Design a binder for this molecule. Sequence first.
Ligand code: SF4
Ligand code: SF4
Ligand code: FES
Ligand SMILES: [Zn+2]
Lengths: 73, 93, 105, 181, 687, 112
Amino acid sequence: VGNHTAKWMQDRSKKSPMELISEVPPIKVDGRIVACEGDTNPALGHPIEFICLDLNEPAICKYCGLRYVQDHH
Amino acid sequence: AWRGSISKSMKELRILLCQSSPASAPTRTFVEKNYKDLKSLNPKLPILIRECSGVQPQMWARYDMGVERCVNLDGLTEPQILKALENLVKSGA
Amino acid sequence: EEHLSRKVIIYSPARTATQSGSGKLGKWKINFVSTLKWENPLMGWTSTGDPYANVGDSALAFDSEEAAKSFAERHGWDYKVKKPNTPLLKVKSYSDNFKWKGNPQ
Amino acid sequence: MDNQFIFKYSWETLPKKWVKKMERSEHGNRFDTNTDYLFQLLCFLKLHTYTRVQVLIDICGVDYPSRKRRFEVVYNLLSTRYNSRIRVQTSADEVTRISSVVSLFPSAGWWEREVWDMFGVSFINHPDLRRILTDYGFEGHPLRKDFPLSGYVQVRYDDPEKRVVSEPIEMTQEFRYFDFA
Amino acid sequence: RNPVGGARVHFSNPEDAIEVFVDGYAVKVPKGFTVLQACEVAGVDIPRFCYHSRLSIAGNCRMCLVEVEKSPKPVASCAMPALPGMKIKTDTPIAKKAREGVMEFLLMNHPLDCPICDQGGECDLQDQSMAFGSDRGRFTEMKRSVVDKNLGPLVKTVMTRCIQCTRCVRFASEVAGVQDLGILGRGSGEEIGTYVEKLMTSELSGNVIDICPVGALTSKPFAFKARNWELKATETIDVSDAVGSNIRVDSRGPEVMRIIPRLNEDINEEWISDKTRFCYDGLKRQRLSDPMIRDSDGRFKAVSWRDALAVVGDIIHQVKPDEIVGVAGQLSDAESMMVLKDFVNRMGSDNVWCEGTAAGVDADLRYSYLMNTSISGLENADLFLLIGTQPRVEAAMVNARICKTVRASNAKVGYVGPPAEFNYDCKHLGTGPDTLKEIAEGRHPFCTALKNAKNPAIIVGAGLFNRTDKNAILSSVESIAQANNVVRPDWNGLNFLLQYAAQAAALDLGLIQQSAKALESAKFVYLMGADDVNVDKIPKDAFVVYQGHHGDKAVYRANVILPASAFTEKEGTYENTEGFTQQTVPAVPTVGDARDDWKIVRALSEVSGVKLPYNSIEGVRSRIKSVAPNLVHTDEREPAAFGPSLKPECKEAMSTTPFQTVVENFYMTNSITRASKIMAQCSAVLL
Amino acid sequence: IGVPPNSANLTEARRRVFDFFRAACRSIPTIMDIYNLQDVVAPSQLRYAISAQIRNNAHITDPKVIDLLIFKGMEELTDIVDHAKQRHHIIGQYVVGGKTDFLKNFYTSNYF
Ligand code: SF4
Ligand code: SF4
Ligand code: FES
Ligand SMILES: [Zn+2]
């Protein structure tokens, strides 16, 4: 719906990828760090990304947009 | 009394000279010796002293309607640079 | 004929500011100042009609100022030379990080 | 007949004024010669019993814009008799004609036409020296470094004239030069 | 052997030179040079991350290790001083293995995000990994991760990529003069940051993007927009101020993508200001693209060039000659200013001047409106006296030079003018001309400090040039300079700081306002890019013609709009504060139906019936040779030929009005900057 | 038939120029027939264009440059005759059949 998506997406029947990724709830992790590969099979995903969870705001994987939060604190 | 009437005759006077060349030495002496009195007698006349590393000693006067005249100062002595100024002030002005 | 009368600039591209390495210097280029491009009104692609659009940065190169000047003067182009800026090496000491401030004033 | 024997024997036997530079390398034995001795050197190599360089594999030009003689003409040759290859090179500029070797190697005819078409080097005593690859009436020599990749003109059908015609080029999307250096 | 990058080596005396060997080779270096510098003189490029020639040596990255004979350990070449007879080896197995190990340690915790990192394609880490350590990774444990920090709208942060080289911290402390960045914590967990939430407010903050060797600090407005290999590089100059900072303009097609500094030891030393770096957005916004005449309903309508020029030419012959006024904009090049002056003088008017405070100054002597010390010459000054100027917001690179001189040589700074925030210690001496009288009369600790200074430097701002008591202020300043021997054959410490890129060339060409109230009595006003003139002083019935590439208020008042080229789209001559003349280089095509300014003026002159004796820019420059020949002798340094002695004595009284502030908003100074998102956001948050 | 050696001096080069000019002029009727120019342009204008091309290069003093120009002229003549590409007002490279220039160029565009 934003200006970025309107540059290429000319169909409003489906949600844009930005809205779709935002609807995925943050994944809870036991710990202060998590590694994201974007796929259950790492060779079929994206280069491994290690994400720090020290901040209260959910941390976003810069490759696939998955979000992670510390489960306890 | 012509030196006190330069403003009435021309809109702008330009003196181009070399900073270090011997050919520009009479022009530099003329500037150093006459600019004080010329500007005091003509407080509202722009007297543009423009020095350049390799220009021949020149002197320009700008009148009405943008008409200009130039005098080549090469091979001239300090008093003859003053005559040329008087000629520019008194004729064609 | 028509393209042999254009004005060009002979220069040595300086080092980029995003990298500390110096391995792309010493080359001399002929800038053809090709600055006539527009947008194709079908896909937004960048169109041009100037034959020397990229030859000065992709193919034509010269190892020295004199070679580029000779080539330009043989082809008859009007050229202006821009001397490259070079760094001045200055005496630097790691001891300077711990200079005595002197007696208090 | 290995490249050590060719280098040594050619040093011993060739007239000295023919060769300015001799390189021995796994990349190939290489002889550089002035343009006025190219023909005689090639005739010697072809006819001499200990060389028998009978096959002219090709002739090609290389453009070096930083050089006073910008063109380098390379002759790749083969001896089936001795199972050996030789490279002979000479330099040239935009106006100096060099000798044709068609009378030595008939295969040279078209390779010389190609050098003339692509680079603009002319060949003395060539029986039929005209362009061979480019379109008729082509202007310029495309393999020169200063010749633009897309050239200067393009063609299209023109209905009012009922024919294909040539106009100055107009590029919908210009060639993008990616400088990774 | 040629030095690396063609670097110049200056010897104070040949006796003060030592001899060292770099890989067998004999090289001669000055005493005090480091091993790395001796390698550069030898032409050997030593890899480095933490070392920067303009910043203090750190010696922490350990990538510059080399082998020195009789040394037990590998030697950090960036920090080790060179000694006579030293035998330096850079390609021995010890050095190669040390480089491989250090590179392996660097990549150990480095994130695998080259495809999303903007440094990709111009990354020192990538190149040195390809070259020195072509070792197959063997680290299989978990990498450390770091949260991103908020530093403002200019610097985008990805701290996982940071290699703790501390270049940004040292730049903040030593060059920017704003200590906001530090290194927090200890060990592998140390993090670069400000600890507390705060944005980088220094006007030189953007250079940390250049100095950061990895993609940890990147340009936020440029984020993700392009790769370095698809950008065309044009070497040109900046027109944001009167400094003339050397820049490289990167473009893709007919669009400027980014602006990065260009090395020039005499002007800006590979640094630029944030205004210079991030003003490129406005080049594609609110562009005047077509000629326009206001219609019957008082609305602009697009026309051809011939119709607009015919209208202007027809209406310019219906006014008195003294009623024609032409004003040149702050971004005008010398050629267009010369053509405008010729056109207006040939219609019988002398009301041609450049917009700004220095509109009607005495331009007879070139020393009186230029920085005679030169920017590089400031580093030799031991004392600074600033009179009515805020160099931090008026000339950012000059202020950077002053700060560097203060930090290095412990020079003192006295300031007279309104209160302002300096990035270096400085005594406030007063606020107005009473302070000048006190300085002239002596009896003050700063007066004896000025007398006890070997090479004092007075810097007078051009903002004082529009005051009513301008002659009195200038006379007092020159008397202070004479009493302290500021101007000597071996030292010219008298300086005047201009504010506009066009001001120096305009003063050289004689674009001087004679009548102080000529704008209030004009019926034909030609505003050649002069968007900063106050247009309510123009009579309501005057015919106003605006020529430029942007505009807010003058465009509203203008009866005719003539679209003009921008500085990135043309080749124009500009002179900076120190009298150095430079030329722009075209980087991108113009937009719409725009034309070069001098072309528009010449075309109008032809339409108006005046025949100028030139039809090309070469003819314009030949004409300029008859007025200001220094303007066509580009890229040349020349000393002053005449000084204060020729000035007539002045007896005007001294007013009591304090000095005012010239630049109220650093980011809003010209029409280009006022049309940029990024500059507006900087004004919103960074001020 | 074969490509001759370079002219030794300006005299023999001038002789080659005269030979080329004669060959070019003698081919004018063939060109008029091939391009159907009877009602478009006179044969003398073709002769005049060829001679003007020869005259515009009258300042050349190097025989090798003259030989190259003659060779190129022969090739262009051969392509014009043997492999004609008919346009209308144009044969090969020649067009067949109160304000100064600055104002016209300014009205045209910003690139002169
Ligand atoms: S800084 Fe960026 S480009 Fe360089 S190695 Fe790291 S991720 Fe790759
Ligand atoms: S952010 Fe960049 S410049 Fe600062 S310490 Fe990290 S790698 Fe070095
Ligand atoms: S460059 Fe010397 S240790 Fe970093
Ligand atoms: Zn992911």
